[PDB]
Design a protein around this nucleic acid. Structure first.
Lengths: 208, 159, 172, 33, 292
RNA sequence: GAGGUAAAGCGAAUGAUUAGAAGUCUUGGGGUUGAAAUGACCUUAACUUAUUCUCAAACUUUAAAUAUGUAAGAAGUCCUUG
RNA sequence: CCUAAGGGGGACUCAUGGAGAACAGAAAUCUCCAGUAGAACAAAAGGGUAAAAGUCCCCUUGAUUUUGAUUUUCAGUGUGAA
RNA sequence: GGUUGCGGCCAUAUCUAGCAGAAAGCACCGUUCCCCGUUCGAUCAACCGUAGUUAAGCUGCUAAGAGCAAUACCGAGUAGUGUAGUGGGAGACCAUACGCGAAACUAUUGUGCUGCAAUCU
């Protein structure tokens, strides 16, 4: 049924999303993007590891599903289902077309599948875990790379978990009462807005 | 098939600016246009009468006629291998004075003003504009500004 | 200054609206209009259905309800007549967040008007719109604006004003 | 007597069932049973 | 349960109306129709007879519009009327007539068309427009501007209109809005217009109220009683004010008890000044400190 | 002067969309309270608030590079009056 | 397709949400508050429009006569339209 | 300097929540014979300026305020891009050379100016 992925590897066409102009589009294979202990707070998983695209390329949704399943299975089998949080950072929004399913007359294709367009340096999957669980997660992502076409790099992030702060400035902000939890993520105090609300929301804030 | 109507392809050009819809400020209706004046053509989407064609949106021309609520504007358009004389009737809402003359008109006054001063002083003065010349020699003092040595930095991943 | 005990901050009735929403048109609506003009002494107005609903049996642009607006001392007189029917006992869930209130009588003859058998009996909605001096600010044509927060009418202020004026009880 | 009628202020020209009128958007009026 | 409406995105995309539209003072549709001049009359200005009524005043200005702002030609205020002999009821229909007559005469005095275009010297309620005089300058042409206030037959704005029309100004108009106009029979009753020109309605009200409600008569017409003005000689007040206006249409400013700088210094005492950035910074620091 | 393409944006409008958090259920169901009170409870799902991941040829506040209109004087500018 | 859905003038503000009123309830009618247009403007889609170009009311036939010029398509011919 | 009338630019002017406002002005405010319009003198119309109030409107000030505006050893000379090579790479794409050069983000600052006429402790 599926053509080989080599037929849809390159970003040759303009983005073709679902809209009010194409409606007979089937759903993407990947439906879950957060796996593992997704409800864990920021502090339990300081280590972040990314799979990063070195290619301007298209990845099919079923390839994303296969890689997600492979990485999840390996990391769960080795270190347990609650030792990590894996997030897929690409969503398939681009509709691929197929023509045959006379000649080149009326050759406009029909929806065939979904793909995500990734750039060079774009993150495909991220995994936040404990430091002691580093070598496991890498090997989990190293296998997921086999489900993708092109070249991908495994990069250990300098930042704390999924936060945009480095591992040293997150500590600097937390020890000053400058950060609170909001479930799986955090909220940072801002020096702008209403003073009373900001002081109430961050009671442990040492003002300078 | 093909559609080539009057306002085809004018989706964004004839739009009002963001947070600038509504009624026209009346300084538009108070400006006085004379024959020979130079005006910038910019179609206003809220007034559909006297609206210019999409080609003339962004063109500058000569006012050749003044009517009750409009002015006649002269535009030169390339059609093939020569220019064709066009005469467009435009309501003053789509017409603004071009600022290119008021800059040049001041230079006419300044050149006249500077020439009479030199004549009154009996000297000669040069009024041609000059392009930016190469800069001349100069001495750089390092007192308080001793050079700092810079080097290319090592590669590092920041994600 | 902004003194609460100012002369112009006194609550008063702006208007009293009487509504009879008979679900059909024709004779019954005309008789309801006759009731309204007998009660208020001024010509009522008929309101058309905004859309067609099969469940209610109404069609768009069909004259369904009839209502009238009374102002001045006549509004006060009719309001106290209606409160006699309600025997001066309203609920806390009769006053809106904007300081107005209202109720509904089931029999219009209880107001003190002569019963007739051609006319029939019709229930009625009384609504009282409360307001202070300076509401014209929000209604005039030139320099129309809003009303300041302290001058606004609210639920609690209307509740205490009603309890003071009519010595009635507001079921909380 | 006079017969005045309330004038039109809304803009809904079509004679169709309006918004905010769905089934099952109501509570159970017979909850006490 | 319902979405909060006043979001930051709501304020970011909000397009505020014009300053004098948000004030609810200038109708820019009508202002565009009035101000805009035929482009072939290049710098010839259109003149507006701006007529505005307050609770205590009538303002009649002759205005020309410009890019930097409107420029006033002449102005007449109802409180100038006591100088001409009208002390009470400065917002009458007849007070409006006197204000219109005064502004028309003052404008023609400023222009220099006094002997020519004297106007309706004998006010008899007849509908009339100022025709041009042959081999002479055309009469001053001004267009009425009533702003946001409604067009009703018998309104006070058309009292100023009639006063200016009888004063020699050429203000195009129709008599179907003057009081005394019959809508069913398309003609104007000159008698009732003349009655409202010389304050007949107020005199009739005093006559009708004096013999019916003595207390309401005393309260409403307290000024007339304290000045010993009966209903019979009210018309003479306006008739003499007309002659006084036509004789001396000049403007006499009120002699100021204080100078401009004295007013400025006295007023500057009762104004709060903006806090320095350091002051509000110190306030924020003190609030943080007192919050432990 | 004009533009709305590249880029960018979505804790900015439209449309698409991942995940939790805290609240309202008073106009969601399930159960456990009651000899009945729709008045509490635990849960799923809905909304709301502050966040979060990813997008748009027929979305956009913003907005290039290149290309494009006009002007750079004697048929001009100024002074007086037919 | 439309004697108005054309023309002029005037008055008003829309979709929606919240809080209230006998029957009346998720949907009738009435009141207030909020409401940058999230409505409507015959018909596709785009643009435009808030004391209006939207809704309603009043009066009307300028949807009239004569013939020229101009714009678009363009040969700078016709037709249509403006 | 305050206020009013008519404005220009059309948020540095808007929005939310509080407080203050001498004089004048404005305003709310009182009445219904008359012109006039309404289901309703609420709006609109007229009369009085007389009986009252700054309660509101209006003006000004406050807010580690929302928005808006401006600036920058902010991001960032980054993204993008014109031109060039018998450059690299299987390709996708990338680097370099001569040029131009963002947006978001970050930080700081600010919160109407002004024209004509009249008027005022």
């Amino acid at each position: 049924a599926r053509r080989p992925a080599r037929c849809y590897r390159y970003c040759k066409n303009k983005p073709y999303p679902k809209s009010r102009y194409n409606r007979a589009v089937p759903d993407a294979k990947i439906r879950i993007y957060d796996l593992g202990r997704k409800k864990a707070t920021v502090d339990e998983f300081p280590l972040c590891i990314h799979l990063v695209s070195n290619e301007l390329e298209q990845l099919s949704s079923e390839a994303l599903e296969a890689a997600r399943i492979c990485a999840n299975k390996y990391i769960t089998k080795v270190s347990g289902r609650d030792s990590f949080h894996l997030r897929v950072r690409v969503h398939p929004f681009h509709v691929l077309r197929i023509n045959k399913m006379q000649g080149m007359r009326g050759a406009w294709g029909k929806p065939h599948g979904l793909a995500a367009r990734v750039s060079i340096g774009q993150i495909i999957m991220s995994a936040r875990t404990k430091d002691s669980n580093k070598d496991v997660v890498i090997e989990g992502l190293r296998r997921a790379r086999y489900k993708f076409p092109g070249q991908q790099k495994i990069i250990i992030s300098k930042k704390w978990g999924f936060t945009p702060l480095n591992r040293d400035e997150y500590i600097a902000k937390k020890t000053n009462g400058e950060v609170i939890d909001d479930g799986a993520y955090v909220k940072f105090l801002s020096r702008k807005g209403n003073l009373e609300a900001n002081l109430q929301q961050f009671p442990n804030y040492q003002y300078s | 098939g093909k559609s080539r109507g009057y306002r085809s392809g004018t989706r964004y050009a004839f739009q009002r600016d963001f947070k600038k819809h509504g009624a026209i400020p009346l300084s538009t209706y108070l400006k006085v246009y004379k024959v020979g004046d130079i005006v910038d053509i910019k179609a206003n989407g809220s007034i559909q009468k006297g609206m210019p064609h999409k080609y003339y949106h962004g063109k500058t021309g000569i006012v050749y006629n003044v009517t009750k609520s409009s002015v006649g504007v002269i535009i030169n358009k390339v059609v093939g291998n020569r220019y064709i004389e066009k005469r467009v009737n435009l309501r003053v809402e789509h017409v603004k004075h071009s600022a290119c003359r008021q800059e040049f008109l001041n230079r006419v006054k300044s050149n006249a003003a500077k020439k009479r001063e030199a004549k009154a002083n009996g000297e000669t003065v040069y009024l041609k504009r000059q392009a930016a010349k190469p800069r001349g020699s100069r001495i750089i003092s390092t007192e308080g500004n001793i050079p700092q040595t810079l080097a290319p930095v090592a590669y590092e991943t920041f994600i | 200054s902004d003194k609460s005990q100012n002369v112009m901050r006194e609550l008063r009735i702006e208007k009293l609206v009487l509504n009879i929403c008979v679900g059909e048109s024709g004779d019954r609506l005309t008789r309801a209009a006759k009731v309204l003009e007998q009660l208020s002494g001024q010509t009522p107005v008929q309101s058309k259905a905004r859309y067609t609903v099969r469940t209610f049996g109404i069609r768009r642009n069909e004259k369904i309800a009839v209502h009238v607006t009374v102002r001045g001392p006549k509004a006060e007189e009719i309001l106290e007549r209606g409160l006699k029917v309600k025997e001066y006992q309203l609920r806390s869930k009769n006053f809106s967040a904007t300081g107005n209130f209202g109720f509904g009588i089931d029999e219009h003859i209880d107001l003190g008007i002569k019963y007739d058998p051609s006319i029939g009996i019709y229930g009625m909605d009384f609504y009282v719109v409360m307001g202070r001096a300076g509401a014209r600010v929000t209604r005039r044509k030139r320099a129309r604006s809003t009303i300041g927060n302290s001058h606004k009418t609210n639920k609690e202020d209307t509740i205490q004003w009603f309890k003071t004026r009519y010595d009635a009880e507001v079921l909380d | 007597p006079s017969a005045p009628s309330r004038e039109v202020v809304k803009k809904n020209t079509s004679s169709k069932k309006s918004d905010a009128a769905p089934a099952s958007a109501d509570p159970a009026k017979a909850k006490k049973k | 349960m319902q979405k909060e409406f006043r979001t930051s995105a709501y304020h970011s995309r909000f397009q505020t109306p014009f300053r004098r539209r948000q004030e609810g003072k200038t109708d820019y549709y009508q202002r565009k129709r009035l101000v805009t001049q035929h482009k072939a009359k290049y710098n010839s200005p259109k003149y507006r007879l701006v007529v505005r009524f307050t609770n205590k005043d009538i303002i009649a200005q002759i205005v020309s519009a410009h890019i930097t702002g409107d420029v006033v030609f002449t102005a007449a205020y109802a409180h100038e009327l006591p100088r001409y002999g009208i002390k009470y009821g400065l917002t009458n229909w007849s007070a409006a007539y006197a204000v219109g007559l005064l502004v028309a005469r003052r404008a023609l005095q400023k222009l220099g068309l006094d002997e020519t275009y004297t106007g309706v010297e004998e006010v008899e309620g007849e509908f009339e427009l100022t025709e041009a005089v042959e081999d002479g300058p055309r009469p001053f042409k001004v267009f009425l501007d009533i702003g946001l206030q409604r067009t009703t037959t018998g309104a006070r704005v058309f009292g100023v209109l009639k006063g200016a029309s009888d004063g020699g100004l050429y203000v195009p108009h129709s008599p179907n809005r003057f009081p005394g106009w019959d809508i069913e029979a398309e003609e104007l009753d000159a008698e009732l217009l003349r009655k409202y020109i010389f304050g007949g309605h107020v005199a009739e009200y005093m006559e009708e109220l004096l013999d019916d409600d003595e207390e309401k008569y005393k309260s409403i017409f307290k000024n007339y009683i304290e000045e010993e003005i009966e209903s019979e000689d009210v018309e003479e007040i306006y008739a003499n004010a007309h002659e006084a206006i036509r004789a001396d249409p000049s403007f006499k400013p009120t002699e100021k008890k204080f100078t401009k700088e004295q007013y400025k210094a006295e007023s500057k005492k009762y104004r709060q000044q903006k806090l320095t950035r350091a002051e509000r910074q110190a306030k924020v620091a003190k609030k943080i400190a007192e919050f432990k």
